C-alpha cells in the first residue's frame, strides 16, 4: 500500500540525505502514526519507527486523539515483553513517553496491567513491566495510590518487597526503586510494612550489581529523615556500611552514599553518634575531594557535572565542621599538614579546598595557625596551575574576616594586591573565583580600601573590557560592593570619570526587557548612594527609566490579572530592581530629588507596589517610602493618610524584611509628621508592641521597632505613653546594644517624653531603663537633663536608703556612671 512509501522513508533515514528525510517525515504527520507503531509491532529498521513515533508524541500529542492513540497503546502493551531486547526497549521508552504527556487520567488501563504483568511467568514481560513501572513512579512528582493502581498499596508494597529476592539483579533493582518512590510521602502501607523493608534492604546490602547498591543507599539516605526511629537502633553498624560505600568503586554508588553524611549531619542525633567514626570518615572525605581525569575535561569549554563526589564530600566536610566545631581539628590538622605543602599539585589543591571547606565551622580553633597559613595561600595565588589559583582565592575569602582584623600591612595589603592581579587573570575560572573573592574582601575590609581605590577602580573598570557575560555579572557585584563598602570616599571627580562611562554603555545598550538589567541596576543603586550629589549629571535619565519600568510592570500585571490567557504575567524582578535604585537615588541625592519626584507619578505608583502580592515588591517600596519621606516630605505628606493603613496591615513578622522596612518608614514618617501623626498611632501601635515582645525576632527588626516606638512616643506621647508599661523590658534590652547615633538620641527622647506623662508605667522595671542609660557615653547636653530629672524623680520618690538598696544589683561602672554623670 502507501506503507511501502513509508517503508522507504524509514529505510533511508537509517549526512545530507538525512536532513531531507527528517523534514519529510516530521511534516507527513498532518496526513499518520498508525503506520509508525504498525511497523514496530508488525530490527533497526522497525526500532527506528517506534522512536520516530516517540518524537511525534513528545512534539505534538494534542493533535493525536482516539483513532491512533488507542491503537498505539493496545499494540505495544501486548508487546511489552518482546524477546528481542531492542524492540522491548523501544516499546518501553514509548509506553513511558505516552504516559507523561497524556497524563494518567487519559490512560487508566495502564498501571493495573503493569502491576499485573509483574507476576508474568515469562521473565521478559516481568522485566519489561517492572522497568516501565519504575519509570512512571519516578517520573511522577505526584505519587501513586489505590485509585490508579487497582490494588491497595497494602497488597502492592509487600509485593515489591517480595521481588527483592528475585534472582535476576535487573529486577531487584526495579523492585527497590519502586518501593523507594514511597518513602517521602510517608505513605501508610509502607510505614506499616516498615520493618520488612529495613530487614529486606539489609539483606540486599552486600549485592554485587551496582544499581541495587545505589538504590539501597538512596533508600537508607531517605529513611534517615522520614523514619529515624527505626534506623537508630542499627546506626553504628549501618554507618560502617555507608563508610565502605563511599570508598566503594563505581562513583555513582560512592556519590549516592556520600549524601548520607550531608543528611545525617543535619540531624540532632549526629554529633553524639558519629564521634567514634570521625577517625575513619574524615580521611575518606578528604580523599574524595581530590580530582581524577576531571582535569582532562576541565583544562581542555571547561565544564564538568554540577554535582559529583568531590562537591558532595566537600559539602559533607563543610557541614561536619559546623556540627563539631574545634573538636574536628585533631581529625584534620595532621592530614592537612600532609596536603598543603606538596609537590603533586592535584593533591596540594584538594588540601586548599579542605582548608576553605572547614573555615566557617573551625574558625576559632583555626586562628592560631593563620599567621603561618595566610601568607602561604597568598603565594599560592600565583601558582603555575590555574585550578590551584582559583580556589585559593575562594579559600582566602573564607578567612577575609580575620585578615582584616590584623594590622592592614601584614595581610590585607599583600592579599589585596595579589587579588587585583588575579581578577585580571588569563583564564575565566580564575577571574570569576578571584573577582568573587575580592567582593568578599571589600565587604570585610571597609575603609581600609580607600588607600587603594585608584588601583581598585583601574582593575574593575579594565575587566569591563576583558570580561564576557558570565564573569561580567560578578564584576557588577564587586563594583557595587565597593561603592557600599567605601561610600562617599568614592565621590571624587577623578573616580566618577573612570567608573561611570562604561556603566552607561551597558545602560544604553540593554533594552528594557533584557534580564541583564538586574545585576546592573542593583550595582548602579549602590553607586548612586555612594557618590552622593556627585551623581547629578546622570540622574535624570536614570530616574525616568526606573519609573517607566515600574509603571510598565504594573500595567502589564493589571492586564494579566484581567485576562491571564490573553496576557502574560510580568517579571516582577524588574521593578524590585527599579524601585531599589530610585531608593538609592533618594538616599544619595536627598533634597535634590524633589523636582523629579514632584513632576513624576512615582507616589501613585508606589501605592500599588505596597499592595502587591509579592513581599519583595512591597519590601522595596516601603524602603523607597522612608527614603522619600526623608528626602522631600513636601510631596509625601499629601497622602500619609493612604500609606499608613497599608503600613499597618504590613507589620507582619512572618515577612521579616517587609515588616522591617515598614517599621522603619513609620518611624521616619513621624519625625516629619510631628503632632499630626496622632490619628495614625492606633493603626500601628498595638502590633508594633506585639513584635517587640514576640520571641525569636532578629535583633535587626527589634532594634528598628524600638527606634520607631521611641520616635512615635517623642512626637505623640499622649497616645503612646499609656502602653509604656509593656514594652520597656525588650525595648531597653534592644537599644542598650546600639551606639550613640542620632537614631538612638531620637529614640530615647521618645521614652523620656513618655515617662513624664506616665511614670507609673516604668517603676516596676526601672532596672532596664538604668542599664539603658548606662549605654550612653555622650548624650546631647539636654538629653542627660531628661535622664537627670527622671532618675532624680526616682531617688526622691523612693528615698535615700530605699534607692541605695536598689543599686546593689549594679555592675560598678553602671552604678558609678549613673552616680558621677547624673548625680544620683
Amino acid at each position: 500500500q502507501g506503507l511501502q512509501q513509508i517503508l522507504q522513508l524509514l529505510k533511508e533515514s537509517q549526512t545530507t540525505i538525512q536532513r531531507t528525510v527528517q523534514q519529510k517525515l516530521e511534516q507527513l504527520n498532518q496526513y499518520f502514526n498508525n503506520y509508525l507503531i504498525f511497523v514496530l509491532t508488525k530490527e533497526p529498521t522497525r526500532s527506528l519507527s517506534g522512536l520516530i513515533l516517540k518524537n511525534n508524541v513528545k512534539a505534538h500529542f494534542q493533535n493525536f486523539p482516539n483513532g491512533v492513540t488507542d491503537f498505539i497503546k493496545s499494540e505495544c502493551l501486548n508487546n511489552i515483553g518482546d524477546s528481542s531486547p531492542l524492540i522491548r526497549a523501544t516499546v518501553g521508552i514509548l509506553i513511558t513517553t505516552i504516559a507523561s504527556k497524556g497524563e494518567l487520567q487519559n490512560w487508566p488501563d495502564l498501571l493495573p496491567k503493569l502491576c499485573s504483568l509483574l507476576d508474568s511467568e515469562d521473565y521478559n514481560t516481568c522485566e519489561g513491566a517492572f522497568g516501565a513501572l519504575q519509570k512512571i513512579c519516578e517520573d511522577s512528582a505526584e505519587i501513586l495510590d489505590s485509585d490508579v493502581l487497582d490494588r491497595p498499596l497494602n497488597i502492592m508494597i509487600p509485593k515489591f518487597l517480595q521481588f527483592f529476592k528475585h534472582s535476576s539483579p535487573k529486577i531487584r533493582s526495579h523492585a527497590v526503586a519502586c518501593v523507594n518512590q514511597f518513602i517521602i510521602s510517608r505513605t501508610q502501607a509502607l510505614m506499616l510494612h516498615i520493618d520488612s523493608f529495613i530487614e529486606n534492604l539489609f539483606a540486599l546490602a552486600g549485592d554485587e550489581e551496582p544499581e541495587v547498591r545505589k538504590n539501597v543507599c538512596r533508600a537508607l539516605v531517605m529513611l534517615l529523615e522520614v523514619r529515624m526511629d527505626r534506623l537508630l537502633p542499627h546506626m553504628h553498624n549501618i554507618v560502617e556500611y555507608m563508610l565502605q560505600r563511599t570508598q566503594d568503586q563505581d562513583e555513582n554508588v560512592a556519590l549516592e552514599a556520600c549524601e548520607f553524611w550531608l543528611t545525617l549531619a543535619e540531624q540532632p542525633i549526629c554529633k553524639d553518634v558519629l564521634v567514634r567514626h570521625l577517625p575513619k570518615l574524615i580521611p575518606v572525605l578528604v580523599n574524595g575531594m581530590k580530582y581524577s581525569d576531571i582535569d582532562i575535561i576541565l583544562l581542555k569549554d571547561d565544564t564538568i557535572s554540577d554535582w559529583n563526589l568531590r562537591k558532595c564530600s566537600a559539602a559533607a566536610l563543610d557541614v561536619l565542621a559546623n556540627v563539631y566545631r574545634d573538636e574536628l581539628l585533631p581529625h584534620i590538622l595532621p592530614l592537612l599538614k600532609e596536603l598543603l605543602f606538596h609537590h603533586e599539585w592535584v593533591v596540594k589543591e584538594s588540601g586548599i579546598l579542605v582548608l576553605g571547606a572547614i573555615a566557617e565551622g573551625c574558625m576559632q580553633g583555626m586562628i592560631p595557625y593563620l599567621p603561618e597559613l595566610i601568607p602561604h595561600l597568598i603565594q599560592c595565588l600565583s601558582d603555575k596551575k590555574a585550578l590551584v589559583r582559583s580556589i585559593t582565592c575562594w579559600t582566602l575569602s573564607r578567612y577575609a574576616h580575620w585578615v582584616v582584623s590584623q594590622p592592614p600591612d601584614t595581610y590585607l595589603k599583600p592579599l589585596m594586591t595579589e587579588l587585583l592581579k588575579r581578577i585580571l587573570d588569563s583564564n575565566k575560572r580564575v577571574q570569576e573565583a578571584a573577582c568573587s573573592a575580592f567582593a568578599t574582601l571589600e565587604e570585610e575590609a571597609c575603609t581600609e580600601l580607600v588607600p587603594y581605590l585608584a588601583y581598585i577602580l583601574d582593575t574593575l573598570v579594565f575587566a569591563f573590557s576583558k570580561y564576557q557575560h558570565k564573569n561580567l555579572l560578578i564584576l557588577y557585584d564587586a563594583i557595587g560592593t565597593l561603592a557600599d563598602s567605601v561610600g562617599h570616599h568614592l565621590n571624587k571627580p577623578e573616580y566618577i570619570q573612570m567608573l561611570m562611562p562604561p556603566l552607561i554603555q551597558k545602560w544604553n545598550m540593554l533594552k528594557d526587557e533584557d534580564k541583564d538589567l538586574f545585576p546592573l541596576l542593583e550595582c548602579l543603586s549602590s553607586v548612586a548612594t555612594a557618590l552622593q550629589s556627585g551623581f547629578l549629571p546622570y540622574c535624570e535619565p536614570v530616574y525616568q527609566r526606573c519609573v517607566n519600568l515600574v509603571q510598565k510592570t504594573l500595567a502589564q500585571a493589571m492586564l494579566n490579572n484581567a485576562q491571564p490567557d490573553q496576557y502574560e504575567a510580568p517579571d516582577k524582578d524588574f521593578m524590585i530592581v527599579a524601585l531599589d535604585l530610585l531608593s538609592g537615588l533618594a538616599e544619595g541625592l536627598g533634597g535634590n530629588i524633589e523636582q523629579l519626584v514632584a513632576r513624576s507619578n512615582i507616589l501613585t505608583l508606589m501605592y500599588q507596589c505596597m499592595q502587591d502580592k509579592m513581599p519583595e515588591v512591597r519590601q522595596s517600596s516601603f524602603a523607597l517610602l522612608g527614603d522619600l519621606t526623608k528626602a522631600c516630605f513636601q510631596h509625601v505628606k499629601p497622602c500619609i493618610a493612604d500609606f499608613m493603613p497599608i503600613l499597618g496591615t504590613n507589620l507582619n513578622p512572618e515577612f521579616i524584611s517587609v515588616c522591617n522596612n515598614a517599621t522603619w518608614a513609620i518611624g521616619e514618617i513621624s519625625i516629619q509628621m510631628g503632632i499630626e501623626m496622632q490619628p495614625y498611632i492606633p493603626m500601628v501601635l498595638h502590633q508594633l508592641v506585639e513584635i517587640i515582645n514576640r520571641p525569636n525576632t532578629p535583633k535587626t527588626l527589634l532594634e528598628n521597632t524600638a527606634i520607631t516606638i521611641g520616635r512615635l512616643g517623642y512626637v505623640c506621647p499622649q497616645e503612646v505613653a499609656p502602653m509604656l508599661q509593656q514594652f520597656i523590658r525588650p525595648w531597653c534590652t534592644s537599644l542598650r546594644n546600639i551606639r550613640d547615633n542620632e537614631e538612638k538620641d531620637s529614640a530615647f527622647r521618645g521614652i523620656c517624653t513618655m515617662i513624664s506623662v506616665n511614670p507609673s508605667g516604668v517603676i516596676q522595671d526601672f532596672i532596664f531603663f538604668c542599664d539603658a542609660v548606662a549605654s550612653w557615653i555622650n548624650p546631647k547636653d539636654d538629653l542627660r537633663d531628661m535622664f537627670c530629672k527622671i532618675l532624680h524623680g526616682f531617688k526622691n520618690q523612693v528615698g535615700d536608703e530605699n534607692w541605695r538598696r536598689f543599686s546593689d544589683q549594679f555592675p560598678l561602672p553602671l552604678k558609678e556612671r549613673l552616680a558621677a554623670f547624673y548625680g544620683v
Binding site: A314, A433, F518, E587, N704
Partner: peptide, 17 residues
C-alpha cells in the same frame, strides 16, 4: 537602617538541590 537580586558568587560545592 533600610533593607539583593543576585548572589552569583563563586562556590566550589554548591548543591543544585
Amino acid at each position: 537602617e533600610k533593607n539583593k537580586r543576585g548572589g552569583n558568587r563563586f562556590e566550589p560545592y554548591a548543591n543544585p538541590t
